Every structure is written in C-alpha cells, then in structure tokens.
Ligand binder design. Structure first.
Ligand SMILES: CCCCn1c(Cc2cccc(OC)c2)nc2c(N)ncnc21
Length: 207
C-alpha cells in the first residue's frame, strides 16, 4: 500500500466539494457515467486500428450496482481503464487547470453542478461518498485499487481482488445520510434525468 498526497489544488477542490452547502448532490452520478462513457469511447476508438485491444473484453457497457448491506453504489465500466501512472500522477496533473478554472467560475456565480465542464467531475463523488475506492485495469498494466477518504491523501495498491478484464469500478462508500442513492427508483430517476442518451447500455442492478 503506497500513500500519496493530492496536489494542493486538488485537495482544495475536494474540501470545497465536501464543505460547501449545496443540496443538488445527485449530479455526481452523471459525472461518473460521463467519465465511463468517455473511457468506453476511447477503447472503442483505439480498437478500430488495433482489434487486439478488445481481447480483454468486447462488451462495452456500464453497470450500476447498489449494495445496501455494504452501503455502496458502484459504477462499473468496461472502458479503457487507468494505468498506475494515470492514478498517481497524470490525472492530477491534468486536473490542475480544470480545478483553477472551476474555483474561479464559482465566483462569477457558477455552481457545483457545472464541475463537469472543467474536466474534474470525478471529485463530485465526494458529495455523497465518505470514501471512494476505484478498481481499474488498463491493457498495458496491472489491476490497481486507488482509494481516498479525502483529507489530503490517497492510496494505491496492486489489486488482489477478482480480476476484471479491462475497465474501471468506482465504488462509492456512501455517507450515512446519503443512502437514497441505493434505491432503485432514485437511481432510475437520476439516470433518466441526466444520463438518458449515453451511447452504451447502462444496466441498473437490483438488490
Ligand atoms: C479525467 C478523466 C480520466 C480519468 N478517469 C476518470 C476520472 C478520474 C479522475 C481522477 C481519478 C480517478 O480515479 C481515481 C478517475 N474516470 C475514468 C474511467 N471511468 N475510466 C477511465 N478513466 C477515467
């Protein structure tokens, strides 16, 4: 288990997301689904010129899996996945500029729902989750588990869990007062409202 500090701008973003009073928390789900859709587009595009990139799984889809016993909502995709370098370094580097922009827009009276326009929508997970675990497998790399409860650090370990072929699972460990996002009718409503035209099957699992 390796522990890393977020870049200061990302930690500041996460604290803003956690601390700002903002009731429209449900938008976290469309930001994660949007990320999954971009990742699926990416592997789909890469496969057109190298069909072997689909040896790790041809099916291109999104699963939403609520688990009341564990209090988690998991967004699974079979998209391109992330490398260790993505997790530790590259995503944060990319996230640096979007963070500043977003934080700037927030006076000029943007609101948190617009976070996705700045390429940092992943962090809106922290509107509803006390802890986020990301399990991910990219073709050129091993399977990894990233985790963070915010507070300025995250961990990365090689994952010994169930091998996943290729793709990413974002496991949201929900805050005590956010269990509505475990309810089928609530998830269905949100997907219909914000993610109704995603170009991949989204299967909402039931409990
Ligand atoms: C900024 C988008 C790329 C990183 N990314 C994201 C957001 C993202 C940002 C920062 C960290 C993170 O995982 C720990 C994930 N979701 C992805 C996905 N489902 N598949 C592939 N890559 C993903």
């Amino acid at each position: 288990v390796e522990t890393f500090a977020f870049q200061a701008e990302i930690a500041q973003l996460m604290s803003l997301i956690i601390n700002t009073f903002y009731s429209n928390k449900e938008i976290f789900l469309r930001e994660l689904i949007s990320n999954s859709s971009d990742a699926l587009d990416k592997i789909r595009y890469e496969s057109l010129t190298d069909p072997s990139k689909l040896d790790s799984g041809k099916e291109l889809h999104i699963n939403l899996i609520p688990n009341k016993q564990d209090r988690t909502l998991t967004i699974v995709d079979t998209g391109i996945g992330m490398t260790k370098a993505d997790l530790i370094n590259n995503l944060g580097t990319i996230a640096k500029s979007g963070t500043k922009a977003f934080m700037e827009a927030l006076q000029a009276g943007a609101d948190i729902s617009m976070i996705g326009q700045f390429g940092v929508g992943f962090y809106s997970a922290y509107l509803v989750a006390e802890k986020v675990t990301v399990i991910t497998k990219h073709n050129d790399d091993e399977q990894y588990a990233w985790e963070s409860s915010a507070g300025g650090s995250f961990t990365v370990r090689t994952d010994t869990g169930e091998p996943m072929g290729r793709g990413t699972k974002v496991i949201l460990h929900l805050k005590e007062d956010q269990t509505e996002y475990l309810e089928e009718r609530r998830i269905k409503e949100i997907v219909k409202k914000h993610s109704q035209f995603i170009g991949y099957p989204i299967t909402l699992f039931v409990e």
